[PDB]
Design a protein around this ligand. Structure first.
Ligand SMILES: Nc1nc2c(ncn2[C@@H]2O[C@H](COP(=O)(O)OP(=O)(O)OP(=O)(O)O)[C@@H](O)[C@H]2O)c(=O)[nH]1
Ligand SMILES: Nc1nc2c(ncn2[C@@H]2O[C@H](COP(=O)(O)OP(=O)(O)OP(=O)(O)O)[C@@H](O)[C@H]2O)c(=O)[nH]1
Lengths: 226, 226
């Protein structure tokens, strides 16, 4: 059981080829990766963004986004339970009919008993990015690391798309990320991780077995900030 | 102020051309129609569906749908307040950071003071349709009628999506709606309207001034059940 991880996905990751909605096939693929972790006695928390769903002001937009993250968390819970994984959803905003509220002592108990816990509604506050919410939750549950799953193999010195001469950095420091043209997460997220010495792994979610390799073996394909 | 109405939109109505999401322009058009009612001392409650946003089992799907109606209600609130209309959102499920909870004595007060009240999360219960939720809220607030705003001009003897010979029925009885194969609302909704003698009007959201004509003048284009 010992190993404990927080896996963060963007909402867009659930949409598939399309720009919006939930692709049940993407969801099912994600569920199987998480199952590989659970079956290996790795304890798993999950944070999902809302970008696949979300005149309109910043604060309102952010609250709508938080609701979207809960819709995604519920859809994910269904996908995981569908393949026999015991799953709990805890929201930073109380929505009692639909999911549990975030309660520290309950989250820890869930993880100790081998449930996957999905955190919705971020920190429950607008203006904080999904990355920051995920980093906060990772630290709160005593995670060994946070994995930011992205469409890309890892962290590059310049966008890989253009120019195509961009190079993958296997490892870098919190300061490399904070003071650099290279975005890993926003500054607030990086700072929070830095000040709690939370290692950040960036990798591609959809390489089969990759999460398991990163967590259990410190292998696979990834970049790490620490 | 005397006149009080509940206006119900499907979620899909907010998506406009696309089948997913929220078309801000459609929202603005809707806001302007509501404004004409408010400026004419008509008290307005609104219910919106979630179909523009929403392995997954029925109960989970319905809860996701309810969250979608709240996202829509917030967007709608933004659109109405953008044009100066005091607007309140009340949810059947408490989501306190984002909107108010449904509270009868509060809803009545809001309406008496000329606020538009948008009801989110339906009845807070799965298996009840948006039409049923809307009929419920309509009766609870003492509405003179419920208006089901649709893409079509009114109620047809047969589907216009099928029937170049399909004719618009100007008036129907509750029994006509219940017994017939004509689509007005689901049986549960019709039964609840019938048992509380709530008149039902079906009409086309899009045509400017139509809501005002229906409510203030008993004119415009529409079908009625009573
Ligand atoms: N929607 C919703 N579900 C809840 C809430 N509290 C508990 N549940 C669900 O009800 C089921 C039973 O809950 P519990 O009695 O706390 O048992 P448990 O979650 O398995 O507890 P652990 O064994 O410690 O992991 C679980 O699926 C919970 O996720 C809640 O406040 N809202
Ligand atoms: N998100 C959220 N907003 C609330 C809640 N309660 C009140 N508000 C909002 O805070 C603002 C002030 O609310 P109130 O002090 O109740 O005054 P009011 O809404 O104007 O009340 P009326 O004059 O009776 O219509 C309004 O925009 C309310 O919608 C709540 O529980 N959650």
């Amino acid at each position: 059981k010992n190993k404990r991880v927080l896996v963060k996905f963007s909402g867009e990751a659930l949409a598939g080829d399309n720009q919006f909605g939930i692709d049940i096939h993407v969801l099912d693929h994600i569920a199987k990766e998480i199952k590989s972790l659970v079956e290996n006695d790795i304890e798993v928390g999950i944070v999902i963004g809302g970008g696949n769903i979300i005149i309109i002001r910043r604060t309102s937009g952010d609250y709508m986004g938080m609701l979207a993250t809960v819709i995604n968390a519920v859809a994910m819970q269904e996908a995981l339970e569908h393949i026999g994984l015991d799953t709990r959803v805890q929201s930073a905003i109380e929505i009692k009919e639909i999911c549990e509220s975030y309660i520290y002592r309950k989250a820890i108990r869930h993880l100790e008993k081998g449930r996957v816990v999905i955190f919705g509604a971020g920190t429950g506050n607008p203006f904080f990015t999904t990355d920051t919410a995920a980093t906060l939750r990772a630290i709160e549950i005593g995670s060994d690391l946070i994995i930011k799953a992205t469409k890309v193999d890892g962290i590059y010195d310049k966008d890989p798309n253009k120019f195509k001469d961009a190079k993958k950095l296997d490892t870098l420091s919190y300061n490399d990320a904070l003071i650099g043209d290279i975005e890993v997460m926003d500054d607030t997220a990086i700072s929070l991780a830095k000040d709690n010495k939370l290692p950040i792994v960036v990798c591609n979610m959809f390489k089969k077995g990759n999460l398991l390799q990163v967590i259990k073996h410190q292998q696979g394909v990834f970049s790490m900030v620490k």
